[PDB]
Design a protein around this ligand. Sequence first.
Ligand code: ATP
Ligand code: ATP
Ligand code: ATP
Ligand code: ADP
Lengths: 513, 526, 16
Amino acid sequence: FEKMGIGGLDKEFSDIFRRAFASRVFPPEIVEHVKGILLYGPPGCGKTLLARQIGKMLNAREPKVVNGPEILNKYVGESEANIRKLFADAEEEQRRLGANSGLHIIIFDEIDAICKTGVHDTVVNQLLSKIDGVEQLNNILVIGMTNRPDLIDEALLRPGRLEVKMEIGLPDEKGRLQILHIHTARMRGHQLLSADVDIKELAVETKNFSGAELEGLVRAAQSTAMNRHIKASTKVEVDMEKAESLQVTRGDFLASLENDIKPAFGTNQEDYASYIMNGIIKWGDPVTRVLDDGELLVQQTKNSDRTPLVSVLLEGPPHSGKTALAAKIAEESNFPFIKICSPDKMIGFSETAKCQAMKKIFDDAYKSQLSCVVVDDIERLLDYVPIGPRFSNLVLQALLVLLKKAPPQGRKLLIIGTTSRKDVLQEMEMLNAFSTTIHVPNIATGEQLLEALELLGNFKDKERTTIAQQVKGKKVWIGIKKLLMLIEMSLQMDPEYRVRKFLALLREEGASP
Amino acid sequence: FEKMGIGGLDKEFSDIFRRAFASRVFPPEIVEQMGCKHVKGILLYGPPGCGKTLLARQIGKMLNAREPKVVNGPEILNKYVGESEANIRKLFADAEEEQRRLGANSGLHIIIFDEIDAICKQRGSMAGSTGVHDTVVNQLLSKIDGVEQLNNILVIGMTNRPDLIDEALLRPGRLEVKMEIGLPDEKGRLQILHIHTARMRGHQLLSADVDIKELAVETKNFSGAELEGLVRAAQSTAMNRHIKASTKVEVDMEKAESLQVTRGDFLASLENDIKPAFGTNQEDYASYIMNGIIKWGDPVTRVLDDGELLVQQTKNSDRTPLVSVLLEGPPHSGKTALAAKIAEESNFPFIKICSPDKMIGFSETAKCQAMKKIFDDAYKSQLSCVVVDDIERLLDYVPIGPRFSNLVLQALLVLLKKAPPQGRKLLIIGTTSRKDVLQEMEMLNAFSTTIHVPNIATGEQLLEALELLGNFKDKERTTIAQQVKGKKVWIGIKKLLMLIEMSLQMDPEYRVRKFLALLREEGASP
Amino acid sequence: MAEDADMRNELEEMQR
Ligand SMILES: Nc1ncnc2c1ncn2[C@@H]1O[C@H](COP(=O)(O)OP(=O)(O)OP(=O)(O)O)[C@@H](O)[C@H]1O
Ligand SMILES: Nc1ncnc2c1ncn2[C@@H]1O[C@H](COP(=O)(O)OP(=O)(O)OP(=O)(O)O)[C@@H](O)[C@H]1O
Ligand SMILES: Nc1ncnc2c1ncn2[C@@H]1O[C@H](COP(=O)(O)OP(=O)(O)OP(=O)(O)O)[C@@H](O)[C@H]1O
Ligand SMILES: Nc1ncnc2c1ncn2[C@@H]1O[C@H](COP(=O)(O)OP(=O)(O)O)[C@@H](O)[C@H]1O
């Protein structure tokens, strides 16, 4: 079926040959028909080629085609009279040759224009009566094509008038491969195509493309190759000396794919990777303890029969790295469904919008078999201010209710919450809702700080010796995010001033719990 | 009245005929000599699915009227000016034309309004506070009874909320007859079952052991639609068994046809197919009673006995048709499982549960509407039981402030005192965990009694709970018993289950140590 | 709600 030059619609044509012409090819004695077809789909999928090849394959008279709304006329009775001139030969043959009459094919292009007020309704009525009226014909086939199937009159689609309804869709990878083969065979035959080009890579790359777009991409590649032998600025030239030897390289196809043609469909944006930027570096035992606790909780959720729902809360001071570790635990969980709820995606919202978003996320979670959800910055979610104080009660009640609603029978859910203000949550009476808690500490001693700096590798040995002289004999209280900020601030000045500036900043930030 | 396909409402039909249609059949000479006009309309109200449209169509057929005009109220409204009034005004044109042509020798026309209350509501007296659809009400009022008189029309309205309708539409000149279609009793259910089995009985497809009397007994709060669906489901199940038997074996087809008779199909379809809207639901007990009820001590029996006594009181009392009770105790005590158990053991036809899990994101007005709908449904039965769970979560209470919703509080306070219609009985069970707040709100005196749900407070009780659960072995049991024989424990069953589940995740050797550490980390006194 | 306001019209001619 590739001979006709259309790929990706072999199965549709098999259906066509089954449902349309089986009765006409089946022996007449055992028979002792269908007269309507409607093709619809997005533009550029080959409907016109289908109609033309259907007209050509059958041994019958030349098909009659009306190009859009040519029937309409300014005078009275002409629009309807134009329709009756189409069926004159069919009626003559039916009345003269009876059953032994040749097939008649009628093609309607952009049929939505004339089917859908005195002119239009009369035209539709005349067409309906002529196709299926008192006199019944059995040697006529009418084909229509549309891009907007929802604008056609319902009465035209009933059985006996338009029976065979067909949809043309965007071809899959094998259909796209067929189309590329069809459009590149001519180039390959004459050895005008370079040996570096692989059709398979092109087929894999061209996602969401249609046939017309693929042919346009090929044409763009040809134009890119051709312009190499064209001179402009002063006058138009053909070169000829090098134009005679024209090869289409892979770079031409790649460049044509970059700009000339576009898929024309949407794109997806991912944000999860953004929650871990600098990675996790082990500067002490506490990180291992937190990860082990997370693994224990994950396993408990996996292998629990009468505790399908489990909750946890992550505690720590500011700039201590809580969201990163929660994301790491969620990633290591290896669950089919994982999502992150953040206040960054809800700026300027009211209480109702936040509640609806949270409910939508949890509704999506409930559908899977085992799911994991992480909520960070609780105090920002239910916006809280120490003055008054002031907060949103609706979100608090929604969270309280959602924290103890089990999923449907046989399914599992894990919830991980992060915060840096535990006394406030305890006052709100929400700390009881969770099942357990974990604590994320800061860097306490100078040995851990030196290990962290060694892992980061920003300072060399000479400065590390002086730093060890200064810090090793004292306790410290600092986070890691702020540590990186301080390092980057200190690095700005010339190599002479760096150590003194760094230690001055460290002394400024020094404190105790 | 069961010869026309309607069973169970003979009294309503008789009263309607006497009050509305006595002058339509009496000879035309004496009715002219008296000088009396005909009734112009009637109103029918009741729960959905009880046979209002059927009765309207049968009345239309009875008096040799023309084909009725059926209208749906919500679909008349349009967004352009003058377009909803034109829709209303189109319905009287044929009657007007026929009366003008033929005078007093014309036929009868019938108009049927469905969900009439959606387009007729009280007009606003205050200036600037007029309703959205006042013009539609005015048009309908002027069409039903105006300066030019029509004497060849009858209007029938159907609704479920008769208290929202304008009072000018119900005066003795407009729609002056009213009737209620309620749920059928045993006799009506028997009549309906007899009506719907006529074809099967005639065509020789019933069995010899089918007893319509027992099936009438079994269904308790069914409407006619439920019974019709039951019959169809039973016949479908019988066909399925026929297919099974035919496909499995080479049996002679005559035995397969003889198997077409149905006696076990009815019971199978009862359980797994039909879910009444005014009956009890068995899919909720599983959600609320998940791990069963194990007897770890005496207090459980006390709670159950008190619930049984309250049920007996509400069933057999005439001076107190409404009773209430509050279950209160410390957190994780298990108040929602025992209230569900007491409700289940009551064996009332109507049982319903109201929880905040189904009101996430709702505003207070929506919650009020939901509660009111539940209670309105409750009032249609003869014996009802309702459960109001987490009274502190329905009020949106937070200690800071404090803050809460006053509308829901007032709605609850009013609902705790309203009795059902005469002869009907209701029981209410509420569960809380903060009774001091309820005492401060002055809600505790609206209830009739209180029951306390305690915690586990002794070592032997904990050992009995462990034995009933059956998780630890003999040696571990001996270790635990020797270490907690002191009766100074304070724990809840739900938290005990959680602790056991968390403990079991460790390696086999380090399991009792983890359990004891977790237990020690917990509290030990009130 | 407020009932949609009034609107203008366009017209089309026909010969005979
Ligand atoms: N499936 C296909 N296989 C091969 N060529 C295709 C295919 N789809 C489109 N084409 C190319 O597109 C052109 C055919 O477009 P055609 O007129 O058949 O599309 P259509 O669906 O009828 O369009 P429209 O709805 O816009 O009128 C030719 O260049 C043909 O090479
Ligand atoms: N061991 C570690 N643990 C956590 N974060 C680490 C670690 N090592 C490096 N990082 C990096 O440190 C940063 C941690 O910042 P993060 O956003 O997690 O802090 P936070 O405590 O949630 O912040 P805040 O309280 O200011 O909102 C991330 O860039 C993370 O990649
Ligand atoms: N004897 C019992 N009494 C109550 N519940 C029991 C008993 N034995 C087992 N259970 C199970 O214990 C759990 C009781 O939890 P329930 O939801 O009733 O607690 P609650 O006091 O309402 O909790 P909270 O207010 O903290 O959410 C249910 O799984 C119930 O099946
Ligand atoms: N009393 C009854 N007897 C027999 N069938 C009934 C009865 N009430 C309802 N039905 C059945 O229920 C179906 C739909 O009921 P319907 O009259 O539409 O309820 P509603 O009163 O809400 O309009 C009908 O097809 C009818 O056969």
